[PDB]
Amino acid sequence: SNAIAVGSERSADGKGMLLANPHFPWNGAMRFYQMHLTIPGRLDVMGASLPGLPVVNIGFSRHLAWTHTVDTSSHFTLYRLALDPKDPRRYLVDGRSLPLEEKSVAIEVRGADGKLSRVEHKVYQSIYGPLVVWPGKLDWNRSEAYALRDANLENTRVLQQWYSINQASDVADLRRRVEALQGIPWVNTLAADEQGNALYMNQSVVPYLKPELIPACAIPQLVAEGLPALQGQDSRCAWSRDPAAAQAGITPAAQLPVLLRRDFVQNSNDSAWLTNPASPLQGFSPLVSQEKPIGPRARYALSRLQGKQPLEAKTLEEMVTANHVFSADQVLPDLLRLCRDNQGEKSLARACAALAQWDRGANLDSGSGFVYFQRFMQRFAELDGAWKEPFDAQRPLDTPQGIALDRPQVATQVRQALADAAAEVEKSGIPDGARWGDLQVSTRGQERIAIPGGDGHFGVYNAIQSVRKGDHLEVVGGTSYIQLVTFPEEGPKARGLLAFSQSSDPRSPHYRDQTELFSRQQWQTLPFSDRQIDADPQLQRLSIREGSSDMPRPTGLAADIRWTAYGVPHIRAKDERGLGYGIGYAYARDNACLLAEEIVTARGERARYFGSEGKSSAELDNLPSDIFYAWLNQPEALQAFWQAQTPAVRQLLEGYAAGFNRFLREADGKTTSCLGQPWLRAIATDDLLRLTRRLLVEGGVGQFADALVAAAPPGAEK
């Protein structure tokens, strides 16, 4: 993801400005959805949300705009267990042998003969949490095992936190509300307001270790490799408690990175360190933020942001729409000289021709030199000491740079890498003169739409990730909800797109209408004021209600919904229950089948409906996925989560479930491709809690779902 907030000292109008370019999946449980929420007098926010959540996750209001990027802080720790020498199912803490707890979950599996069979699976747990096995790295033998403690399993505040963000007035209010609750699971927050403040916060839920414990409690070999691993045989390595923290064991808000400026702040998934290089952020826990070389996207952004010239909205938009492959700036000059040094090497002629004509872009009409450049860079990354100027901590924005062609060993390996890359490109089936837009597409029914952009690891700010499918590259994730917000006199001016369009259902009018615009890179107004909404010739309006009494006076659930162009709903209600009612109904109209599928996943019922050979939209096998979510979303966990919700959040969720179900009752297939399927059914608030918790652990134990399912104690092997 990318984010840039510009303040009064650098903006062309002297006010705040925000570019939100989150990079997220184009399908599944993290597919963004645009909506505008209003409870007149006290809530008025617009942006995009994630499936099943009745709050705006990235968006803007009258005076404020905010967005998020995945951060580099740890949101869990691994614990290396010391096993009981007498018993591999017991482990030692302060030399005392403790038994592992055993939790069995039962999964129903649809077999080839259509019958259901029951599968029982044991999940072993320690005082820290479940055991995890990565064969060859985190084993469970007779000496050691590994447990995982996820900090967000106890974060019952996540929905309250975004509802609170949705009510924030300006940057200072937003900061207060986030630091007060500490409900953000695993993202940075960047924001700008009309008075020209630009805010960066690494304010998320992070395991807390007092500084004196961190070197003693770490596992050096695992930490050096990138895992937050601690000594689990020592009770002194438990997360530290500080009553200023909102949650037992997490890092107090005052110890997390914050930068409040009036020039700019930026983040492209590196640490807090170089958010703005004029004020580096340093001295934090390694669980929080480290001074690691920035990736090419952030290096690109900083190359465009530094200096003293004022920044216009158009400048930020074109940082996305230029599709510049910034990694080429570092190697392509040296690479093209090697090409000029080896004319008549027939093995390099096509590659060198394509790389020389190339516009250095990932545009629809960029030539095949992009493909040659990608395959080369995949090999260049594996070479040792091939940079002319290696990374230099005192030049962290300008290094590494160039190829060390003057060393004949580097020259030999680089030329071989280019030959191998050329061979791979030509081995694969791609026409002569094919262009990048001819290769990378998003399928919509039986047709394709050409998609610009390229992988973010090549320094394309418009990051697009794709996989080979048949004859093409199918987009699976990247640029998603785009929002560029400025604050002129009359109200917030928001511009952007939802790259993959509002609806995942091929029957919907809003299945590919913004994707056509994304292909052409034509961003649109995001209408927010009543005047803007009223000016839309596509405007449609629906009022819905159901429930208690209903008279001699207004009772029950009620919402007013207006849709503007591209199927963007604007939901007005007098309370949270009515607001949720409108959200659930509108979301179901566009995405009922998606939500039903993701609820099956979060209920651990994939194998029941689809058998063991299928996968979830997260690409986990159905039965391991079911085991994980049956373990994650046990009744006791859901009940405790529900009991911790505020009245307002409970009401939002109750309304959402009722509005979703209202659409299902009335649907006749106009926009719903799965009517009649046994897994498309009425939902409950528990189902929304299952989705919420599934999202909660995406920064923690969820990433280890396969490792949890694989964790079993050794037998009698040598």
Side-chain angles (χ1 to χ4, degrees), residues 1-344 347-431 433-717:
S1 297
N2 310 309
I4 300 168
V6 181
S8 56
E9 289 168 1
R10 293 292 308 284
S11 64
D13 65 0
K15 305 183 184 168
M17 174 167 58
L18 181 74
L19 176 68
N21 182 213
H23 299 153
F24 267 76
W26 279 33
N27 303 101
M30 291 184 313
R31 179 194 173 115
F32 278 117
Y33 181 79
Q34 294 183 268
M35 66 186 184
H36 172 200
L37 308 183
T38 303
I39 302 178
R42 67 181 178 81
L43 176 83
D44 192 19
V45 63
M46 175 172 187
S49 68
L50 293 171
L53 305 189
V55 298
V56 172
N57 293 111
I58 289 176
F60 63 99
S61 53
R62 178 64 183 82
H63 303 292
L64 177 71
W66 85 95
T67 186
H68 299 289
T69 64
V70 172
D71 64 34
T72 60
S73 318
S74 290
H75 304 287
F76 68 96
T77 59
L78 289 172
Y79 276 102
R80 180 174 69 172
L81 305 180
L83 297 183
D84 188 329
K86 274 162 99 71
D87 190 343
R89 300 180 195 189
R90 303 183 70 94
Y91 61 106
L92 299 170
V93 181
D94 294 354
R96 181 164 72 103
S97 180
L98 306 179
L100 293 167
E101 44 197 8
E102 299 183 1
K103 195 186 299 205
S104 285
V105 305
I107 306 307
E108 300 277 0
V109 179
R110 183 202 169 100
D113 60 351
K115 300 159 186 170
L116 293 180
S117 67
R118 178 173 162 111
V119 176
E120 291 200 9
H121 187 93
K122 289 190 56 62
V123 183
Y124 291 88
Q125 301 196 228
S126 67
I127 60 184
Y128 311 110
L131 271 63
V132 292
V133 164
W134 179 353
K137 169 72 65 38
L138 305 175
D139 293 320
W140 183 352
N141 56 38
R142 294 193 167 263
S143 306
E144 70 181 37
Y146 289 84
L148 196 155
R149 182 179 178 183
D150 177 317
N152 276 302
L153 286 178
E154 300 163 85
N155 177 9
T156 62
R157 310 170 303 289
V158 55
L159 296 175
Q160 181 189 354
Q161 180 70 90
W162 262 279
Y163 193 45
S164 178
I165 289 170
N166 287 183
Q167 300 173 73
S169 60
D170 62 17
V171 149
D173 192 48
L174 169 68
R175 181 184 181 175
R176 290 193 301 270
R177 287 169 175 276
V178 168
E179 290 181 356
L181 201 54
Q182 300 192 271
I184 297 184
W186 34 261
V187 292
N188 297 302
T189 304
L190 291 84
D193 59 14
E194 173 177 347
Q195 45 269 74
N197 303 99
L199 175 70
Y200 165 86
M201 296 189 290
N202 190 330
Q203 283 290 341
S204 58
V205 172
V206 176
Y208 183 43
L209 263 198
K210 298 181 150 142
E212 51 272 41
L213 300 170
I214 284 174
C217 283
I219 312 275
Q221 48 270 47
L222 291 179
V223 166
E225 290 169 9
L227 291 168
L230 302 176
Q231 308 275 352
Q233 77 285 32
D234 193 334
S235 61
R236 296 168 292 195
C237 296
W239 299 355
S240 305
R241 283 166 143 289
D242 185 320
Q247 179 184 312
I250 77 170
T251 302
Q255 302 188 34
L256 297 171
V258 174
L259 203 57
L260 175 61
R261 316 262 302 172
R262 290 178 167 270
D263 51 350
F264 73 86
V265 289
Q266 62 78 37
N267 182 265
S268 285
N269 304 126
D270 309 292
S271 75
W273 187 24
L274 300 182
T275 298
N276 186 323
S279 187
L281 289 165
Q282 305 175 107
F284 297 95
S285 166
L287 295 160
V288 168
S289 183
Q290 299 183 75
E291 307 176 5
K292 182 182 178 180
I294 59 179
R297 282 181 290 118
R299 195 169 161 196
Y300 168 77
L302 285 176
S303 81
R304 304 319 279 182
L305 289 172
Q306 284 187 321
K308 300 207 170 63
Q309 286 323 292
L311 296 160
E312 292 180 343
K314 172 181 187 310
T315 303
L316 302 182
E317 167 171 348
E318 289 180 348
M319 294 177 65
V320 178
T321 57
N323 296 305
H324 181 53
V325 180
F326 180 74
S327 284
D329 285 22
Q330 285 95 57
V331 344
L332 181 64
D334 289 334
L335 191 53
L336 287 166
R337 308 172 263 243
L338 176 157
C339 275
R340 293 192 295 272
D341 284 329
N342 297 270
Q343 322 179 22
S347 68
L348 308 177
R350 296 179 68 85
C352 290
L355 292 163
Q357 69 69 32
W358 179 37
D359 71 343
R360 294 87 164 101
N363 304 289
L364 294 190
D365 65 9
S366 295
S368 63
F370 188 27
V371 178
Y372 283 104
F373 179 75
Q374 291 174 76
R375 309 296 171 259
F376 169 81
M377 285 295 289
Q378 287 156 8
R379 289 155 180 87
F380 186 74
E382 292 311 302
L383 304 179
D384 320 303
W387 290 117
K388 191 190 275 275
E389 306 174 53
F391 175 75
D392 177 9
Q394 287 228 299
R395 298 179 67 233
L397 320 181
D398 301 289
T399 61
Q401 176 71 37
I403 301 179
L405 290 175
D406 52 344
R407 310 172 146 143
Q409 44 289 20
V410 171
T412 292
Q413 301 178 13
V414 171
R415 175 166 68 263
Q416 187 62 58
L418 181 59
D420 295 344
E424 184 193 330
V425 168
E426 282 132 43
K427 201 182 186 194
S428 74
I430 290 187
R435 276 160 272 162
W436 180 242
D438 301 319
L439 311 176
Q440 175 172 264
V441 302
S442 183
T443 299
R444 290 290 182 277
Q446 270 142 63
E447 179 48 3
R448 304 168 185 196
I449 296 169
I451 304 298
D455 201 284
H457 298 287
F458 301 126
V460 193
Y461 215 57
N462 178 30
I464 296 289
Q465 166 194 58
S466 54
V467 301
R468 251 112 65 197
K469 281 180 96 189
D471 51 350
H472 60 270
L473 293 176
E474 181 79 24
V475 172
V476 299
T479 289
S480 49
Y481 175 58
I482 301 172
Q483 167 185 289
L484 176 53
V485 181
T486 52
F487 297 99
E489 310 215 23
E490 43 279 54
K493 171 180 175 179
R495 178 172 164 78
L497 283 177
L498 187 65
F500 38 72
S501 307
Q502 276 287 78
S503 175
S504 62
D505 199 299
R507 294 183 180 187
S508 157
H510 307 297
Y511 175 58
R512 51 174 280 160
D513 54 350
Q514 300 194 67
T515 307
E516 294 165 3
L517 299 176
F518 184 69
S519 187
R520 301 191 285 271
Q521 304 204 118
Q522 294 171 350
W523 301 6
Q524 304 295 329
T525 296
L526 310 178
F528 180 72
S529 71
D530 278 331
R531 195 229 92 218
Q532 293 180 300
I533 295 165
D534 282 346
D536 190 322
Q538 291 303 301
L539 180 58
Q540 161 193 18
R541 193 176 172 193
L542 178 70
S543 306
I544 53 174
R545 64 152 296 281
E546 73 181 56
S548 267
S549 292
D550 44 342
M551 301 146 185
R553 81 181 145 269
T555 53
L557 307 114
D560 182 78
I561 310 168
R562 293 174 299 177
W563 289 268
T564 48
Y566 320 122
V568 177
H570 310 253
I571 300 119
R572 275 182 304 200
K574 74 180 176 58
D575 57 24
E576 282 84 2
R577 197 188 298 278
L579 189 72
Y581 192 60
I583 298 165
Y585 181 93
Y587 188 73
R589 190 178 82 160
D590 293 317
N591 285 294
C593 300
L594 181 158
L595 202 79
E597 277 263 5
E598 299 307 336
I599 284 169
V600 165
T601 301
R603 294 171 59 89
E605 291 173 343
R606 295 208 64 74
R608 181 204 176 94
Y609 290 105
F610 308 119
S612 62
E613 289 188 11
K615 290 183 173 59
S616 72
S617 65
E619 303 283 355
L620 299 190
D621 287 7
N622 280 353
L623 185 45
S625 185
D626 288 346
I627 294 162
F628 177 72
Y629 286 112
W631 171 85
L632 177 69
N633 284 326
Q634 295 170 59
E636 309 70 10
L638 299 185
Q639 285 163 24
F641 192 98
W642 179 253
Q643 271 300 274
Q645 299 310 297
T646 64
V649 168
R650 296 189 194 200
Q651 292 159 17
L652 288 166
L653 297 169
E654 284 157 7
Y656 186 111
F660 188 93
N661 293 342
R662 164 87 180 260
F663 179 84
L664 281 190
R665 287 199 300 275
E666 301 172 347
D668 76 349
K670 291 190 212 64
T671 59
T672 310
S673 292
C674 60
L675 288 186
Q677 294 294 334
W679 45 267
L680 176 65
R681 45 213 296 161
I683 69 175
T685 53
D686 272 356
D687 290 323
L688 305 175
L689 301 191
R690 294 181 175 93
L691 291 172
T692 299
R693 292 177 60 79
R694 168 173 178 199
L695 292 187
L696 254 184
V697 301
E698 169 75 11
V701 70
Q703 290 298 323
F704 286 81
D706 291 312
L708 181 153
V709 174
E717 56 263 15

PDB file of all heavy atoms in Angstrom, residues 651-664:
ATOM      1  N   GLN A 651     -25.494  -2.543  17.793  1.00  0.00           N
ATOM      2  CA  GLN A 651     -26.614  -2.096  16.967  1.00  0.00           C
ATOM      3  C   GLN A 651     -26.239  -2.026  15.485  1.00  0.00           C
ATOM      4  O   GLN A 651     -27.052  -2.384  14.624  1.00  0.00           O
ATOM      5  CB  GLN A 651     -27.105  -0.743  17.477  1.00  0.00           C
ATOM      6  CG  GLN A 651     -27.760  -0.859  18.862  1.00  0.00           C
ATOM      7  CD  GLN A 651     -27.809   0.460  19.614  1.00  0.00           C
ATOM      8  OE1 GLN A 651     -27.656   1.534  19.029  1.00  0.00           O
ATOM      9  NE2 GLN A 651     -28.010   0.381  20.928  1.00  0.00           N
ATOM     10  N   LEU A 652     -25.027  -1.558  15.167  1.00  0.00           N
ATOM     11  CA  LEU A 652     -24.569  -1.577  13.777  1.00  0.00           C
ATOM     12  C   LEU A 652     -24.610  -2.987  13.205  1.00  0.00           C
ATOM     13  O   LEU A 652     -25.047  -3.194  12.067  1.00  0.00           O
ATOM     14  CB  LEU A 652     -23.145  -1.028  13.674  1.00  0.00           C
ATOM     15  CG  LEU A 652     -22.869   0.466  13.847  1.00  0.00           C
ATOM     16  CD1 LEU A 652     -21.357   0.714  14.043  1.00  0.00           C
ATOM     17  CD2 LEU A 652     -23.407   1.253  12.647  1.00  0.00           C
ATOM     18  N   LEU A 653     -24.124  -3.966  13.977  1.00  0.00           N
ATOM     19  CA  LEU A 653     -24.059  -5.353  13.510  1.00  0.00           C
ATOM     20  C   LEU A 653     -25.449  -5.967  13.409  1.00  0.00           C
ATOM     21  O   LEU A 653     -25.741  -6.716  12.464  1.00  0.00           O
ATOM     22  CB  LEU A 653     -23.177  -6.171  14.466  1.00  0.00           C
ATOM     23  CG  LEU A 653     -21.711  -5.731  14.536  1.00  0.00           C
ATOM     24  CD1 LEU A 653     -20.927  -6.389  15.700  1.00  0.00           C
ATOM     25  CD2 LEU A 653     -21.042  -6.107  13.216  1.00  0.00           C
ATOM     26  N   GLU A 654     -26.321  -5.671  14.379  1.00  0.00           N
ATOM     27  CA  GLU A 654     -27.692  -6.170  14.305  1.00  0.00           C
ATOM     28  C   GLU A 654     -28.407  -5.637  13.069  1.00  0.00           C
ATOM     29  O   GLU A 654     -29.118  -6.383  12.386  1.00  0.00           O
ATOM     30  CB  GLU A 654     -28.466  -5.784  15.566  1.00  0.00           C
ATOM     31  CG  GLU A 654     -28.118  -6.623  16.772  1.00  0.00           C
ATOM     32  CD  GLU A 654     -28.446  -5.911  18.084  1.00  0.00           C
ATOM     33  OE1 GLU A 654     -29.069  -4.824  18.035  1.00  0.00           O
ATOM     34  OE2 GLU A 654     -28.070  -6.434  19.159  1.00  0.00           O
ATOM     35  N   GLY A 655     -28.256  -4.344  12.787  1.00  0.00           N
ATOM     36  CA  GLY A 655     -28.860  -3.789  11.591  1.00  0.00           C
ATOM     37  C   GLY A 655     -28.292  -4.405  10.326  1.00  0.00           C
ATOM     38  O   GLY A 655     -29.039  -4.749   9.408  1.00  0.00           O
ATOM     39  N   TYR A 656     -26.961  -4.561  10.265  1.00  0.00           N
ATOM     40  CA  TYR A 656     -26.337  -5.127   9.068  1.00  0.00           C
ATOM     41  C   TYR A 656     -26.895  -6.507   8.757  1.00  0.00           C
ATOM     42  O   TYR A 656     -27.262  -6.796   7.609  1.00  0.00           O
ATOM     43  CB  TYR A 656     -24.811  -5.188   9.241  1.00  0.00           C
ATOM     44  CG  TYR A 656     -24.055  -5.640   7.998  1.00  0.00           C
ATOM     45  CD1 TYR A 656     -23.257  -4.752   7.300  1.00  0.00           C
ATOM     46  CD2 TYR A 656     -24.100  -6.974   7.558  1.00  0.00           C
ATOM     47  CE1 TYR A 656     -22.530  -5.163   6.162  1.00  0.00           C
ATOM     48  CE2 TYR A 656     -23.381  -7.391   6.428  1.00  0.00           C
ATOM     49  CZ  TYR A 656     -22.598  -6.471   5.738  1.00  0.00           C
ATOM     50  OH  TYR A 656     -21.876  -6.846   4.621  1.00  0.00           O
ATOM     51  N   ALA A 657     -26.930  -7.387   9.758  1.00  0.00           N
ATOM     52  CA  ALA A 657     -27.496  -8.717   9.551  1.00  0.00           C
ATOM     53  C   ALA A 657     -28.941  -8.627   9.070  1.00  0.00           C
ATOM     54  O   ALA A 657     -29.324  -9.325   8.129  1.00  0.00           O
ATOM     55  CB  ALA A 657     -27.403  -9.549  10.838  1.00  0.00           C
ATOM     56  N   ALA A 658     -29.753  -7.739   9.669  1.00  0.00           N
ATOM     57  CA  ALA A 658     -31.142  -7.652   9.219  1.00  0.00           C
ATOM     58  C   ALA A 658     -31.250  -7.113   7.791  1.00  0.00           C
ATOM     59  O   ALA A 658     -32.127  -7.548   7.026  1.00  0.00           O
ATOM     60  CB  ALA A 658     -31.962  -6.798  10.190  1.00  0.00           C
ATOM     61  N   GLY A 659     -30.384  -6.174   7.407  1.00  0.00           N
ATOM     62  CA  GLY A 659     -30.480  -5.617   6.067  1.00  0.00           C
ATOM     63  C   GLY A 659     -29.985  -6.580   5.007  1.00  0.00           C
ATOM     64  O   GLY A 659     -30.575  -6.691   3.925  1.00  0.00           O
ATOM     65  N   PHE A 660     -28.897  -7.288   5.300  1.00  0.00           N
ATOM     66  CA  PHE A 660     -28.446  -8.347   4.408  1.00  0.00           C
ATOM     67  C   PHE A 660     -29.553  -9.371   4.200  1.00  0.00           C
ATOM     68  O   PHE A 660     -29.873  -9.745   3.063  1.00  0.00           O
ATOM     69  CB  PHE A 660     -27.187  -9.007   4.994  1.00  0.00           C
ATOM     70  CG  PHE A 660     -26.531  -9.991   4.069  1.00  0.00           C
ATOM     71  CD1 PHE A 660     -25.513  -9.586   3.212  1.00  0.00           C
ATOM     72  CD2 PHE A 660     -26.923 -11.325   4.059  1.00  0.00           C
ATOM     73  CE1 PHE A 660     -24.898 -10.503   2.345  1.00  0.00           C
ATOM     74  CE2 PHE A 660     -26.318 -12.241   3.199  1.00  0.00           C
ATOM     75  CZ  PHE A 660     -25.301 -11.836   2.346  1.00  0.00           C
ATOM     76  N   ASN A 661     -30.182  -9.806   5.294  1.00  0.00           N
ATOM     77  CA  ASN A 661     -31.209 -10.834   5.186  1.00  0.00           C
ATOM     78  C   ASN A 661     -32.445 -10.325   4.454  1.00  0.00           C
ATOM     79  O   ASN A 661     -33.098 -11.094   3.743  1.00  0.00           O
ATOM     80  CB  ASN A 661     -31.587 -11.347   6.572  1.00  0.00           C
ATOM     81  CG  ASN A 661     -30.453 -12.091   7.223  1.00  0.00           C
ATOM     82  OD1 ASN A 661     -29.516 -12.507   6.545  1.00  0.00           O
ATOM     83  ND2 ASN A 661     -30.533 -12.280   8.527  1.00  0.00           N
ATOM     84  N   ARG A 662     -32.786  -9.049   4.633  1.00  0.00           N
ATOM     85  CA  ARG A 662     -33.889  -8.459   3.875  1.00  0.00           C
ATOM     86  C   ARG A 662     -33.648  -8.587   2.374  1.00  0.00           C
ATOM     87  O   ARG A 662     -34.539  -9.005   1.620  1.00  0.00           O
ATOM     88  CB  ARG A 662     -34.065  -6.993   4.281  1.00  0.00           C
ATOM     89  CG  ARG A 662     -34.912  -6.138   3.295  1.00  0.00           C
ATOM     90  CD  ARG A 662     -36.376  -6.224   3.599  1.00  0.00           C
ATOM     91  NE  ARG A 662     -37.206  -5.437   2.687  1.00  0.00           N
ATOM     92  CZ  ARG A 662     -37.706  -4.234   2.968  1.00  0.00           C
ATOM     93  NH1 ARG A 662     -37.453  -3.654   4.135  1.00  0.00           N
ATOM     94  NH2 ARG A 662     -38.476  -3.611   2.080  1.00  0.00           N
ATOM     95  N   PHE A 663     -32.433  -8.267   1.916  1.00  0.00           N
ATOM     96  CA  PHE A 663     -32.163  -8.422   0.490  1.00  0.00           C
ATOM     97  C   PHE A 663     -32.334  -9.870   0.043  1.00  0.00           C
ATOM     98  O   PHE A 663     -32.889 -10.128  -1.033  1.00  0.00           O
ATOM     99  CB  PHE A 663     -30.764  -7.932   0.120  1.00  0.00           C
ATOM    100  CG  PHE A 663     -30.455  -8.108  -1.348  1.00  0.00           C
ATOM    101  CD1 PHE A 663     -30.868  -7.162  -2.275  1.00  0.00           C
ATOM    102  CD2 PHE A 663     -29.812  -9.244  -1.805  1.00  0.00           C
ATOM    103  CE1 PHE A 663     -30.607  -7.335  -3.635  1.00  0.00           C
ATOM    104  CE2 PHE A 663     -29.557  -9.425  -3.165  1.00  0.00           C
ATOM    105  CZ  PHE A 663     -29.943  -8.466  -4.075  1.00  0.00           C
ATOM    106  N   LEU A 664     -31.836 -10.824   0.842  1.00  0.00           N
ATOM    107  CA  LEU A 664     -31.928 -12.237   0.475  1.00  0.00           C
ATOM    108  C   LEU A 664     -33.376 -12.692   0.334  1.00  0.00           C
ATOM    109  O   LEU A 664     -33.694 -13.509  -0.541  1.00  0.00           O
ATOM    110  CB  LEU A 664     -31.219 -13.105   1.518  1.00  0.00           C
ATOM    111  CG  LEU A 664     -29.697 -13.220   1.483  1.00  0.00           C
ATOM    112  CD1 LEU A 664     -29.262 -14.325   2.439  1.00  0.00           C
ATOM    113  CD2 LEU A 664     -29.198 -13.492   0.082  1.00  0.00           C
TER     114      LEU A 664
END
